[PDB]
Amino acid sequence: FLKNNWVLLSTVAAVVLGITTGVLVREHSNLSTLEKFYFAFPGEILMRMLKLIILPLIISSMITGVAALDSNVSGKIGLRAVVYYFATTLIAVILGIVLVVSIKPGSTVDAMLDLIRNMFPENLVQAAFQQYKTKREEYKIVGMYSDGINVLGLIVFALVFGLVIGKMGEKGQILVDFFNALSDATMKIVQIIMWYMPLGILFLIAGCIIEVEDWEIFRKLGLYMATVLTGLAIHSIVILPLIYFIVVRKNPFRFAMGMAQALLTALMISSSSATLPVTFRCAEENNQVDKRITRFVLPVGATINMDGTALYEAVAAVFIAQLNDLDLGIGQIITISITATSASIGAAGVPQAGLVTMVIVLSAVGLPAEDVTLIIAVDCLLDRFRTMVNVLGDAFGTGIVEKLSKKELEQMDVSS
Numbered sequence: 001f002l003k004n005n006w007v008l009l010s011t012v013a014a015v016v017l018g019i020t021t022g023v024l025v026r027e028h029s030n031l032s033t034l035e036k037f038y039f040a041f042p043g044e045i046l047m048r049m050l051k052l053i054i055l056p057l058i059i060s061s062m063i064t065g066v067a068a069l070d071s072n073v074s075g076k077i078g079l080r081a082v083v084y085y086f087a088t089t090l091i092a093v094i095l096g097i098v099l100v101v102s103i104k105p106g107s108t109v110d111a112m113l114d115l116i117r118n119m120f121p122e123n124l125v126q127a128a129f130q131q132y133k134t135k136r137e138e139y140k141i142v143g144m145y146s147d148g149i150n151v152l153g154l155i156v157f158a159l160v161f162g163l164v165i166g167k168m169g170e171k172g173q174i175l176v177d178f179f180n181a182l183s184d185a186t187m188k189i190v191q192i193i194m195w196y197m198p199l200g201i202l203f204l205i206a207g208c209i210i211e212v213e214d215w216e217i218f219r220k221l222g223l224y225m226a227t228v229l230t231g232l233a234i235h236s237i238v239i240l241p242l243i244y245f246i247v248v249r250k251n252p253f254r255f256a257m258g259m260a261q262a263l264l265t266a267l268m269i270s271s272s273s274a275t276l277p278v279t280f281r282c283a284e285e286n287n288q289v290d291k292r293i294t295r296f297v298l299p300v301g302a303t304i305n306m307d308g309t310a311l312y313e314a315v316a317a318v319f320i321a322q323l324n325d326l327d328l329g330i331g332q333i334i335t336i337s338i339t340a341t342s343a344s345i346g347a348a349g350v351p352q353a354g355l356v357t358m359v360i361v362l363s364a365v366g367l368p369a370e371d372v373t374l375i376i377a378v379d380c381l382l383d384r385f386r387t388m389v390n391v392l393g394d395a396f397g398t399g400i401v402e403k404l405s406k407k408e409l410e411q412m413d414v415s416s
């Protein structure tokens, strides 16, 4: 039995050995900056592999999932998924705002316009490794292209392309076959990378622990951890199971038990995109969910649905505002809530710590962007829990959308 699940136990042992090695090296050894950088080399290699595999997986899976569905019922399923994601994000934002205000632990228009611009890129080839940003200048607007994959535009193009080739009929069957084969090949390559994962996980955790030097910053920011962790726990244990139970009259915790494999995997990597194959297997096999709904809903949720991220950012922005003793009125609460939801619509193909999402909210509330370094220390610990919450929300949404589309799925069975 151990051989079949050998990757999971190996990764758990890697986590244990990483904590031990990091603590022992930090306490009993002295390292310079260059030596600390060279210590985390295998973790850097693992991250490069995952970033490499993101693009083909996302594009091919999106096209295949959209083209599988019939054109009659494609719109309703997408609308239901969008509504669920929007509602969950709003509830998470409200919960985070309420908790951060109660506990008290301590332009933007251009960013929104850039967000809309990135949905319709000028060039498809450039959109695979570059993004678009605008800045003011003495007032004249000037645009520039910066490195970083544009997952928002590629997802929109993939959705439209999949619909077009699924409506065409026999004339576009060769394209469907091409992208199905590409998706299968990408999943197999992801498995091959997951074979090597444990060593990268070991060295990543070891490097994470060693970096902290003072070790009193954790004690100072103890209240800040409690707010974020309590919000994530309440959202994961209370709100999401209750929403699932209201729509689907089943046991919400049996679904989580079936998805436990992908949940713990998502904790390991802390990447929602890289957990797509495990999530597919767990949803289709353990929970007996339909493949047609799953293959289409899950990639969209990975790119779009970010409950833990919205909660995390909102709490951090309010905490930073409280650090500076800046007053926050009723309007300030709303504009932080609204900006947090729409800050980073798509950031799935980017598996590393992004401070730009915080910077948008900071600019909207009118605070300097140099306050990020104060709390940049604990991101390495909080990000894994945030990604786990995101993956859990996606998994719950798959079943919720599947239940609500019984008539559409029955209509799709007579044409098969």
Ligand code: NA
Residues within 6 Å of the ligand: 084, 085, 086, 087, 088, 089, 090, 305, 306, 307
């Ligand atoms: Na949501």
Ligand code: NA
Residues within 6 Å of the ligand: 272, 301, 302, 303, 304, 305, 306, 390, 391, 394
């Ligand atoms: Na997600």
